Write an enzyme that holds these catalytic residues in place. Structure first.
Site, PDB file in Angstrom:
ATOM      1  N   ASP A 130       0.847  -1.180   0.000  1.00  0.00           N
ATOM      2  CA  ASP A 130       0.000   0.000   0.000  1.00  0.00           C
ATOM      3  C   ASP A 130       0.886   1.235   0.000  1.00  0.00           C
ATOM      4  O   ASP A 130       1.923   1.262   0.668  1.00  0.00           O
ATOM      5  CB  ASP A 130      -0.936   0.029   1.213  1.00  0.00           C
ATOM      6  CG  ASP A 130      -1.889   1.206   1.185  1.00  0.00           C
ATOM      7  OD1 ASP A 130      -2.646   1.331   0.206  1.00  0.00           O
ATOM      8  OD2 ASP A 130      -1.883   2.009   2.141  1.00  0.00           O
ATOM      9  N   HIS A 165      -6.476   4.513   5.317  1.00  0.00           N
ATOM     10  CA  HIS A 165      -5.682   5.503   4.597  1.00  0.00           C
ATOM     11  C   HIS A 165      -4.325   5.744   5.247  1.00  0.00           C
ATOM     12  O   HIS A 165      -3.736   6.818   5.086  1.00  0.00           O
ATOM     13  CB  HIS A 165      -6.452   6.819   4.454  1.00  0.00           C
ATOM     14  CG  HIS A 165      -7.816   6.645   3.865  1.00  0.00           C
ATOM     15  ND1 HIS A 165      -8.018   6.117   2.608  1.00  0.00           N
ATOM     16  CD2 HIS A 165      -9.045   6.906   4.366  1.00  0.00           C
ATOM     17  CE1 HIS A 165      -9.314   6.072   2.355  1.00  0.00           C
ATOM     18  NE2 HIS A 165      -9.960   6.544   3.407  1.00  0.00           N
TER      19      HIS A 165
HETATM   20  N1  DCM Z   1     -10.219  10.974  -1.438  1.00  0.00           N
HETATM   21  C1  DCM Z   1      -8.851  10.669  -1.749  1.00  0.00           C
HETATM   22  C2  DCM Z   1      -8.398   9.276  -1.770  1.00  0.00           C
HETATM   23  C3  DCM Z   1      -7.005   8.966  -2.086  1.00  0.00           C
HETATM   24  N2  DCM Z   1      -6.092  10.015  -2.377  1.00  0.00           N
HETATM   25  C4  DCM Z   1      -4.722   9.708  -2.685  1.00  0.00           C
HETATM   26  C5  DCM Z   1      -3.823   9.942  -1.375  1.00  0.00           C
HETATM   27  C6  DCM Z   1      -3.710   8.783  -0.825  1.00  0.00           C
HETATM   28  O1  DCM Z   1      -2.455   8.698  -0.005  1.00  0.00           O
HETATM   29  C7  DCM Z   1      -3.636   7.840  -2.024  1.00  0.00           C
HETATM   30  C8  DCM Z   1      -4.009   6.502  -1.673  1.00  0.00           C
HETATM   31  O2  DCM Z   1      -5.334   6.455  -1.154  1.00  0.00           O
HETATM   32  P1  DCM Z   1      -5.684   5.366   0.022  1.00  0.00           P
HETATM   33  O3  DCM Z   1      -5.590   6.062   1.374  1.00  0.00           O
HETATM   34  O4  DCM Z   1      -7.077   4.840  -0.179  1.00  0.00           O
HETATM   35  O5  DCM Z   1      -4.723   4.223  -0.008  1.00  0.00           O
HETATM   36  O6  DCM Z   1      -4.616   8.460  -3.016  1.00  0.00           O
HETATM   37  C9  DCM Z   1      -6.551  11.412  -2.353  1.00  0.00           C
HETATM   38  O7  DCM Z   1      -5.791  12.299  -2.594  1.00  0.00           O
HETATM   39  N3  DCM Z   1      -7.951  11.713  -2.034  1.00  0.00           N
HETATM   40 MG    MG Z   2      -3.672   3.444   1.853  1.00  0.00          MG
HETATM   41 MG    MG Z   3      -4.433   1.951  -1.771  1.00  0.00          MG
END
Ligand code: DCM
Ligand code: MG
Ligand code: MG
Ligand code: DCM
Ligand code: MG
Ligand code: MG
EC number: 3.1.11.2
Lengths: 223, 220
Positions: free
Chosen positions: B11, B181
């Site tokens: 991840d 996240h």
């Molecule tokens: N609403 C969101 C979802 C994700 N991300 C980007 C930043 C996160 O670090 C990356 C990975 O998402 P996740 O936390 O689901 O792994 O995608 C973002 O900018 N805004």
């Molecule tokens: Mg993540």
């Molecule tokens: Mg991810």
């Protein structure tokens, strides 16, 4: 003096699992490093209430947890409390404590701002001498030759003289009233130790800066 | 090689969404041998318990200083920001990090497959961009990868609707995931989702695993 090697910029909380007690000439089976910047520890929520809740680990942290195949089997008691065994580690393809691992540790340490200090519970009598023995066998020079180290048992005794047993779980069940989780696992005990060291962060860092000594001065456990 | 001995659940956290050409701020690797997944208790009952993590696991979790700032939204969900990462001494995505990853992968029995949720569209392309910025040759050239969305879609049609990480975890185990996240949190959640039907997952990985060398960069 008060700063024999400057302000430690990161603490690396360290725990080892091994095949047995020192008399058995033990070998490492599991290793966990949890590197925390000084500021992350300083900016921990201040302990208040009775009992204070287990502190939240800092958001920014570097972690390395590795299972290692030993050369000889674990003793009965060791294999049961750690949940590890030589046979189970080998069938899962775990490699021995070798030069590639030293490179891994070097690269991991190199991502941390210096000076850096290892923090291990009973490290002065177990983890550090054992890790010194394991590193001595390698052709690669020790990646810890410029790293400092400290025993958290000595640290908390000094801190708790804010005027008793100092095993990991006893201290944990004294500051907080919860039981420690995942006892006798590398990552488990590191997280338990981190929670203990987050109890009085500023005082802990002060004691650490005072007592940090080079890991190169650690006598090997054997060999 | 085609019979996977190691799954590396992966991840990344980053500064924003793909259109912003983001940079990695956090990455977590959790390496599990095929035997540890195979010997996970089959999921029984409705809901089944959250499977136990294997005892034998290799874990690497690193925070990384990005070149550009995190978007306000990305900082809100990840809890990370360029300013706090840099004041805590985090280094860039540099050659030493590639050396670190290389040595970590070297300890895993081959062949080895990366498993990441939405990896085909996010993690793997982004990681290819970060590595292509380095003079050090990619240490993932030789390792395989797979997207767990496609995996869970196939396993859930097998018997008989959102495929976000949280949605799957909650549908399977009837409770909210923890530490969403964050790199390590989402990896542990992904592991739990993949421990649902491990036999069927490992079989599905062997048929769809794809060399990371073929992943196209996200930008640059
Ligand atoms: N609403 C969101 C979802 C994700 N991300 C980007 C930043 C996160 O670090 C990356 C990975 O998402 P996740 O936390 O689901 O792994 O995608 C973002 O900018 N805004
Ligand atoms: Mg993540
Ligand atoms: Mg991810
Ligand atoms: N009854 C005991 C207690 C400890 N140890 C050894 C093996 C452990 O891996 C090592 C580290 O102890 P701990 O699990 O508390 O970190 O000490 C042992 O062999 N027998
Ligand atoms: Mg210990
Ligand atoms: Mg331990």
């Amino acid at each position: 003096q008060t700063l024999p090697h400057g302000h430690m910029q990161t603490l690396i909380f360290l725990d080892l699992e091994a095949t047995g007690l020192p008399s058995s000439r033990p070998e490492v089976t599991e290793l966990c490093l949890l590197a925390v910047h000084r500021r992350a520890l300083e900016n921990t929520s201040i302990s208040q209430g009775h009992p204070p809740p287990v502190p939240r680990p800092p958001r920014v942290v570097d972690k390395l947890s590795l299972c290692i195949a030993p050369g000889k089997a674990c003793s009965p008691g060791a294999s049961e409390i750690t949940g590890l065994s030589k046979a189970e580690l080998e069938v899962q393809g775990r490699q021995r404590f070798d030069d590639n691992l030293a490179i891994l540790l070097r690269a991991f340490l190199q991502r941390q701002p210096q000076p850096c200090c290892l923090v291990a519970h009973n490290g002065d009598r177990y983890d550090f001498p054992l890790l010194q023995t394991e590193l001595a066998r390698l052709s690669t020079p020790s990646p810890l030759d410029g790293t400092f180290c400290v025993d958290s048992i000595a640290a908390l005794k000094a801190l708790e003289q804010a005027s008793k047993s100092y095993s990991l779980g006893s201290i944990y069940t004294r500051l907080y009233w919860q039981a420690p989780t995942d006892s006798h696992t590398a990552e488990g005990d590191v997280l338990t130790l981190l929670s203990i060291c987050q109890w009085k962060p500023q005082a802990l860092l002060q004691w650490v800066d005072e007592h940090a000594r080079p890991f190169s001065t650690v006598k090997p456990m054997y060999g």
